[PDB]
Amino acid sequence: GTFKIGLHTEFQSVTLTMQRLLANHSNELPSLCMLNNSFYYMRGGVNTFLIRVSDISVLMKEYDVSIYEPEDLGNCLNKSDSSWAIHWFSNALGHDWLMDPPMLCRNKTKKEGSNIQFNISKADDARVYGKKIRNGMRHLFRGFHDPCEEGKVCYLTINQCGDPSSFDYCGVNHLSKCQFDHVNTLHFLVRSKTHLN
Amino acid sequence: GTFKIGLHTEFQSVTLTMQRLLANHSNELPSLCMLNNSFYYMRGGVNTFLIRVSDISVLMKEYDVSIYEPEDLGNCLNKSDSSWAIHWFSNALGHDWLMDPPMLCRNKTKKEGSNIQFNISKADDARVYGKKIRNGMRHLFRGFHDPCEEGKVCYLTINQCGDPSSFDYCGVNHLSKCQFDHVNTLHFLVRSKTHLN
Amino acid sequence: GTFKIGLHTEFQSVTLTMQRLLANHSNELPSLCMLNNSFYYMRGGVNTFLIRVSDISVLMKEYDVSIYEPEDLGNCLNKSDSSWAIHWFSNALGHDWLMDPPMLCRNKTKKEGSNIQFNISKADDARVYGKKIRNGMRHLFRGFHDPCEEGKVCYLTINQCGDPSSFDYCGVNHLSKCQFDHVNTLHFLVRSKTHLN
Amino acid sequence: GYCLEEWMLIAAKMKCFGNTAVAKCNQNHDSEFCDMLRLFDYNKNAIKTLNDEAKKEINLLSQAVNALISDNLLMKNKIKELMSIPYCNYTKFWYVNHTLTGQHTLPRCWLIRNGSYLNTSEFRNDWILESDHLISEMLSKEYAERQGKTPITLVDICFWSTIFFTASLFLHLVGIPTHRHLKGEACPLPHKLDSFGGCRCGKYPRLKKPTIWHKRH
Amino acid sequence: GYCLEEWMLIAAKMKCFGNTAVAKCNQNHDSEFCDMLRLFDYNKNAIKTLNDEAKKEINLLSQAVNALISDNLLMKNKIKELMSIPYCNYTKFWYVNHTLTGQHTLPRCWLIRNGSYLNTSEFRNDWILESDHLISEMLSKEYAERQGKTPITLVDICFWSTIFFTASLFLHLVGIPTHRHLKGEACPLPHKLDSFGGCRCGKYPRLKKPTIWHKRH
Amino acid sequence: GYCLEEWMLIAAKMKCFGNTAVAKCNQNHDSEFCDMLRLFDYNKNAIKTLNDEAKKEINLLSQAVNALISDNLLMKNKIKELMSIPYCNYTKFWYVNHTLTGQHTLPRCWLIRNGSYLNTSEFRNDWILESDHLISEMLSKEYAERQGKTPITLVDICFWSTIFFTASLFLHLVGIPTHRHLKGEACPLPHKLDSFGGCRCGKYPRLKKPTIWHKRH
Amino acid sequence: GQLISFFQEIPVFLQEALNIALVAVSLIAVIAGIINLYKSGLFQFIFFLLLAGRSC
Amino acid sequence: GQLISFFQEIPVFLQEALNIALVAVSLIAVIAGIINLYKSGLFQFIFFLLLAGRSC
Amino acid sequence: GQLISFFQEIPVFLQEALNIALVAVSLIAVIAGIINLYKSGLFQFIFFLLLAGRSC
Ligand SMILES: *[C@@H]1O[C@H](CO)[C@@H](O[C@@H]2O[C@H](CO)[C@@H](O[C@@H]3O[C@H](CO)[C@@H](O)[C@H](O)[C@@H]3O)[C@H](O)[C@H]2NC(C)=O)[C@H](O)[C@H]1NC(C)=O
Ligand SMILES: *[C@@H]1O[C@H](CO)[C@@H](O[C@@H]2O[C@H](CO)[C@@H](O[C@@H]3O[C@H](CO)[C@@H](O)[C@H](O)[C@@H]3O)[C@H](O)[C@H]2NC(C)=O)[C@H](O)[C@H]1NC(C)=O
């Protein structure tokens, strides 16, 4: 990787890592890694979650629980040890509680597990919250890309890893092969109001 | 405006401008200008507004509809195409709809048209909202020599141009004389909490 | 304090004070001083308050006044001319009354004056309130040491000087021997969101 | 070097600024002209890149104004305006330009008080010192560039070689004695005399007589 | 130069600091002494401007503190305080002063640890290095002042003229041959010999005989 | 100088960077490598001292991340990424190292476009200029060290003394007349004659006769 | 280019004592070197080389 | 004033080898120049000019 | 050490007209100074001192 650049001067490169530091103090700060365009990951402490963006919608607003209070949002958590990671991700994406549209959730009794769903479609009554959520994911996740289509239907999904909603992707598979990006954490711990949020 | 400063060096000056940036991209950042010691103008999108501060008030608190919500304020406009500029100016002055005195308006169907008025008089029960509004207006508009006097009435009036009450001071005949300032935009597009709002 | 470094260079030092700024701009520049681990003073305008941290607080939630509204906070002052000092202390300590358990206080007529208490004990249901108030005091008071211990009870005492509960520690004795720090007032006024609050 | 388009100026045409003067904006967060240039660069990039595609659903301009200009400079100008002392309103910039070489200083604000420009007399010392600094920078740039290409060891070698050569010339003019001559006697060549004036051959006895020094004869 | 009044110091009279020492505060955002000087200067400006009228309805002092004080430096000092390592509490500043010239360094914090000023033995490497940097800065300032007025082209011209003159002196000592001499023959003056040693006059035939060079005679 | 242990590098062991290159980070706030070094140093300090005590209920780690990291650089990189132009993701840094002396430049980002590292042909000018600047800095550091210890006055004294000595040698070769000689007469020694040819002794009348100049004889 | 550029800047340079001293010493050195070369016979050697065996 | 300031700083300047070398070179050059002016007639010429037609 | 480092960097330095000029001037000055010392008699004086009264 080093080639001669002059007579005695030589081109050299060094590669640094911060993923160890992300794990070193894994508490009070998650580690974010993006698998590809439609898949994203989040690891908080000893619990890892999956962030999915796509047009599918397995969860409905009619006969399912909807989340309003910032304290009772633990319904989509089968192992309800702590939903602090989900809460901190939600209020770091720019989402609000006082006057912001709510998000869907699923009963913990069902085997599907956590199925936190957001509505980010570019349509009527959805261009105020969806754009803000996508800006939040742009600021947190480095290489975020929009998979939705203008004037069509598109959603967002958050699922704890190990649940059927996360499928076999989680476990010792995707999160293991995913590399935590420290720029995500650096953008994630700064509160200057000058960012995209 | 160039004169000899030395032997071969010369004194030279360059004049810069931001008209194209503030006109080709009129949306998401209105252009402001101080036309007179008491007359100010706001041009958001494709509609021009008049902002004046004085002691003469035509609005009354007996048979006029008030404004408490940041969403129903669009009713207070005869040509209610878009009052997002009014809303963004209002929440950029530092005014908060939660714990601040409210504002009234004129009926849209009335001949005189829309008339947004603020109470910034230096008197009892008005030295908290008025000072904050005047500080926000000092931040937004470069020059501000307020006419409000202690113990005397003084009001801030916002009038969408085109209304008969706006007089000939609006339209193509006037307004153009005022020079839109980019420093107003610079103090207007930054959220650092270290400003006068 | 001056000694020779080289054959011609001499070590020298200058000591700077900022008491004139704090004294002249009393309303604009509140001054904070620390007596020792458990004692602090706040001097706003022409009135001085006592900030005390102790494990014991002689109050009770049954028959003591609790303050919720940001307007009736002036009750906890025998000479209720102005409680703006307590207002600024509360809003700069990081303590927002909207979604944070309130404080406790004694009656105006009862012969102990203002005894506003923040329950910062490191125990159950107080692992956020106490930590936030501790971070606020650490921000506002340089050299702040916490005598509160985990798994036990501890409180924060506020009392304007001259009250019977203030004891002989107030007056022109300890208040004078305590030295107001300008780092405290520099931290008190900057609003950058990057501080411990 | 850097050039400003026609629409960026008032009552003028396209004007080009030197790279060295513009390069002073790399670490200068206390100059308004650099902030205006950064805003112009951001506008140029946005038109070419962030405007062709219909993906303009993100308000990157606000975040640019947050970071691409110095907010503390804006607040200092606002404080100066509120204290009725001269301030910058980001419209007119003056500089000192060397006509022959084209090297010019970084443009500085034409301060305004009471809503009117200064009359080039209330900041006379400012532009006098700025012209002096321009001359100093022109003279020092050559020194810096020369020191960046010419080693100081080579300069020292040349200087000491010149000193050695001048000393050699001096010893050439004055001359240095090459052999000793006995007092009252002729030149003892080809024989050589020691400090005591004796010879190992035995011709000259070691009488320890005083001796003098003479050059080549 | 820049001076601090009586009320700005403790147990000391009015103190004045040089322009060169305080010139470092123009771009330095990592110095606490510069922040204190900025606060004092802002107060001085406010007294002369924001005191003649009771219109002080604006928190300009707070805005300036948010602007002319480096929040990053203050937060770093707070972190050092909370990490049980020496920090600055903005009260005592030490510097190295050259007694004769009267020009000194920019004052630096006298760190306090355990609520006590570190003795002048834990940062001993700081003030020795600061005095060395002061001497180096004085000499470098002299060099820069020299280079700002004297062109390097003129220095090069002088050096090459001196080299030319020294070479001329050397050739003066050695002497340059003027006209050739034949083997064992006198100089052909006023006639001149070509490369073959002949003469166009016909006196010297072109026999290609070897020739030697001789100086003036 | 500054050293990074093995756990902070990928596919590499512990390596050390020169102090002078790291010293460029003292006032640098537009460099990502400096920010990464600051984060590493903060981690090392926190683990050494703050981690030992169980009072870790205070987020100095975050309060430093938002303080010792320039958010302007992060947001500029984010804007560059959103414009689909190369940006820095704080992973791989490249620099130019002088193999013999062992002193190098401050590492610079290996920019990434389309989520892939740029090949060493798009920023060829970048590392060419980096090598040129490294050579210039190596040559200029010696000049700076010389100027920090050798006075300008001493160099001036040496140069003027050399000029005086060269002029003295020139006057030695050419010779300067020591006394006047009357036209058509012998040497007037030991008497001294003025421009008129007379003297106070009375032997030579003041006839205003022309006189010539002769050297020592 | 450097020489002509320095020539166009003589009046501004000829304001400090050191610059005037440098110009004077440079001119004196050049003049004295020309005199020495003329006195040392280098010009005579050049003249002999140019007209070797062609004129008398 | 520059010479006086330089003389006041000799003890700190005379701590590096190059400074001592420069001082020695300067002193030797000045001494040799004085000798040369003594050995080339500058002193004799000045003495003759000052006492031209006034003494023997 | 300084001389060794400078000699190790000659090819880098010998790419500019001024550097080659300085090297040539230094070499010519050293050579001519050696010649002058040989011609003046320093070498002869050293030889006489080393073999004073020991050879003929
Ligand atoms: C997420 O938000 C999108 C925003 O488009 C919702 O999609 C929209 O859903 C409505 C029914 O709720 C569809 O019918 C429309 O309803 C109203 C009248 O009831 C009116 O806007 C139209 O006339 C139409 O009938 C609408 O077509 C559909 N829009 C698109 C673009 O697909 C979606 O239901 C939300 N999802 C959840 C789970 O809340
Ligand atoms: C910044 O962006 C670059 C470019 O996308 C990322 O470079 C990637 O770095 C990872 C390791 O962190 C490389 O994976 C490694 O590849 C080989 C086998 O292919 C081997 O050394 C390791 O086993 C490992 O799998 C990856 O190839 C590389 N990608 C590219 C396109 O060069 C870099 O990680 C980013 N920085 C972050 C995310 O912090």
Ligand SMILES: *[C@@H]1O[C@H](CO)[C@@H](O[C@@H]2O[C@H](CO)[C@@H](O[C@@H]3O[C@H](CO)[C@@H](O)[C@H](O)[C@@H]3O)[C@H](O)[C@H]2NC(C)=O)[C@H](O)[C@H]1NC(C)=O
């Ligand atoms: C805008 O707010 C101002 C206060 O800043 C309101 O004006 C105030 O009107 C009341 C009602 O007359 C005055 O209060 C009382 O007035 C009587 C009559 O002189 C006198 O006994 C006392 O002055 C008493 O407080 C008050 O002085 C007056 N303040 C002034 C001078 O501005 C005004 O009504 C508000 N207007 C709207 C449109 O809301």
Ligand SMILES: *[C@@H]1O[C@H](CO)[C@@H](O[C@@H]2O[C@H](CO)[C@@H](O[C@@H]3O[C@H](CO)[C@@H](O)[C@H](O)[C@@H]3O)[C@H](O)[C@H]2NC(C)=O)[C@H](O)[C@H]1NC(C)=O
């Ligand atoms: C100030 O806050 C502290 C906690 O930070 C409160 O002390 C805690 O009060 C609760 C009340 O439920 C105690 O829980 C119960 O207390 C008793 C004695 O143990 C018993 O009924 C139960 O076993 C249970 O523990 C809790 O123990 C106690 N904690 C400590 C460390 O004493 C305190 O009451 C608050 N004070 C006020 C005036 O609100």
Ligand SMILES: *[C@@H]1O[C@H](CO)[C@@H](O[C@@H]2O[C@H](CO)[C@@H](O[C@@H]3O[C@H](CO)[C@@H](O)[C@H](O)[C@@H]3O)[C@H](O)[C@H]2NC(C)=O)[C@H](O)[C@H]1NC(C)=O
């Ligand atoms: C910053 O403040 C200065 C001083 O108030 C403003 O200077 C003003 O510049 C405008 C042009 O932008 C000048 O108007 C011009 O006047 C004449 C006569 O009409 C003519 O050249 C043009 O047609 C144009 O109208 C104006 O006179 C001048 N004011 C003063 C007092 O010199 C400047 O505009 C401000 N910068 C802003 C607001 O961005």
Ligand SMILES: *[C@@H]1O[C@H](CO)[C@@H](O[C@@H]2O[C@H](CO)[C@@H](O[C@@H]3O[C@H](CO)[C@@H](O)[C@H](O)[C@@H]3O)[C@H](O)[C@H]2NC(C)=O)[C@H](O)[C@H]1NC(C)=O
């Ligand atoms: C920064 O921290 C240092 C170290 O704690 C503080 O130094 C303290 O300064 C005060 C005066 O401001 C000193 O008090 C003085 O002590 C003697 C003996 O009484 C006398 O000179 C005066 O009468 C006065 O009382 C105090 O001794 C000194 N403390 C130490 C440990 O040296 C400094 O005040 C702090 N800065 C701020 C702004 O609080």
Ligand SMILES: *[C@@H]1O[C@H](CO)[C@@H](O[C@@H]2O[C@H](CO)[C@@H](O)[C@H](O)[C@H]2NC(C)=O)[C@H](O)[C@H]1NC(C)=O
């Ligand atoms: C500094 O002054 C020089 C004078 O030559 C300017 O160079 C000329 O600028 C004018 C501007 O109208 C051009 O038309 C000419 O072609 C330029 N001549 C050249 C480049 O030889 C130079 O632009 C000035 N520098 C500034 C304004 O920054």
Ligand SMILES: *[C@@H]1O[C@H](CO)[C@@H](O[C@@H]2O[C@H](CO)[C@@H](O)[C@H](O)[C@H]2NC(C)=O)[C@H](O)[C@H]1NC(C)=O
């Ligand atoms: C550095 O030291 C010099 C020499 O002592 C100081 O100059 C004197 O400072 C005192 C301070 O009381 C004044 O009264 C004198 O008038 C100054 N001049 C002389 C000639 O004695 C100089 O102020 C010091 N620099 C500082 C303290 O920054």
Ligand SMILES: *[C@@H]1O[C@H](CO)[C@@H](O[C@@H]2O[C@H](CO)[C@@H](O)[C@H](O)[C@H]2NC(C)=O)[C@H](O)[C@H]1NC(C)=O
């Ligand atoms: C620049 O290159 C030099 C020469 O290779 C490096 O110096 C080596 O540093 C390593 C560090 O582990 C030592 O083990 C070697 O002995 C050194 N070699 C020498 C002195 O010849 C130097 O570290 C490089 N600079 C960097 C990588 O920043």
Ligand SMILES: *[C@@H]1O[C@H](CO)[C@@H](O)[C@H](O)[C@H]1NC(C)=O
């Ligand atoms: C991303 O990777 C997952 C791995 O399970 C795959 O199922 C999915 O199709 C990929 N998405 C894209 C857009 O390639």
Ligand SMILES: *[C@@H]1O[C@H](CO)[C@@H](O)[C@H](O)[C@H]1NC(C)=O
């Ligand atoms: C989840 O299912 C259980 C079991 O039927 C039911 O009691 C509970 O109310 C459900 N929760 C929600 C939030 O619908």
Ligand SMILES: *[C@@H]1O[C@H](CO)[C@@H](O)[C@H](O)[C@H]1NC(C)=O
């Ligand atoms: C303000 O300017 C307008 C411009 O048309 C003018 O009509 C009006 O009288 C001015 N008011 C004052 C008092 O300056």
Ligand SMILES: *[C@@H]1O[C@H](CO)[C@@H](O)[C@H](O)[C@H]1NC(C)=O
């Ligand atoms: C205006 O008057 C009409 C009745 O003529 C009324 O219905 C309407 O509500 C009034 N405007 C507002 C904004 O209340």
Ligand SMILES: *[C@@H]1O[C@H](CO)[C@@H](O)[C@H](O)[C@H]1NC(C)=O
């Ligand atoms: C602190 O100082 C006060 C001064 O009144 C004293 O009463 C108290 O005992 C001291 N110590 C503690 C631990 O509070």
Ligand SMILES: *[C@@H]1O[C@H](CO)[C@@H](O)[C@H](O)[C@H]1NC(C)=O
């Ligand atoms: C204080 O006591 C008085 C009676 O002495 C009572 O009227 C008042 O409400 C009390 N205030 C409180 C409890 O805040």
Ligand SMILES: *[C@@H]1O[C@H](CO)[C@@H](O)[C@H](O)[C@H]1NC(C)=O
């Ligand atoms: C300042 O401008 C005002 C008008 O804005 C004018 O009345 C006043 O005379 C001006 N003051 C000076 C000193 O020129």
Ligand SMILES: *[C@@H]1O[C@H](CO)[C@@H](O)[C@H](O)[C@H]1NC(C)=O
């Ligand atoms: C401004 O300067 C010009 C220079 O021509 C002069 O004529 C004019 O009087 C000056 N104006 C003032 C107000 O001093």
Ligand SMILES: *[C@@H]1O[C@H](CO)[C@@H](O)[C@H](O)[C@H]1NC(C)=O
């Ligand atoms: C710190 O200061 C305290 C109070 O003087 C003292 O008891 C303690 O021994 C000191 N220890 C250290 C580590 O400096």
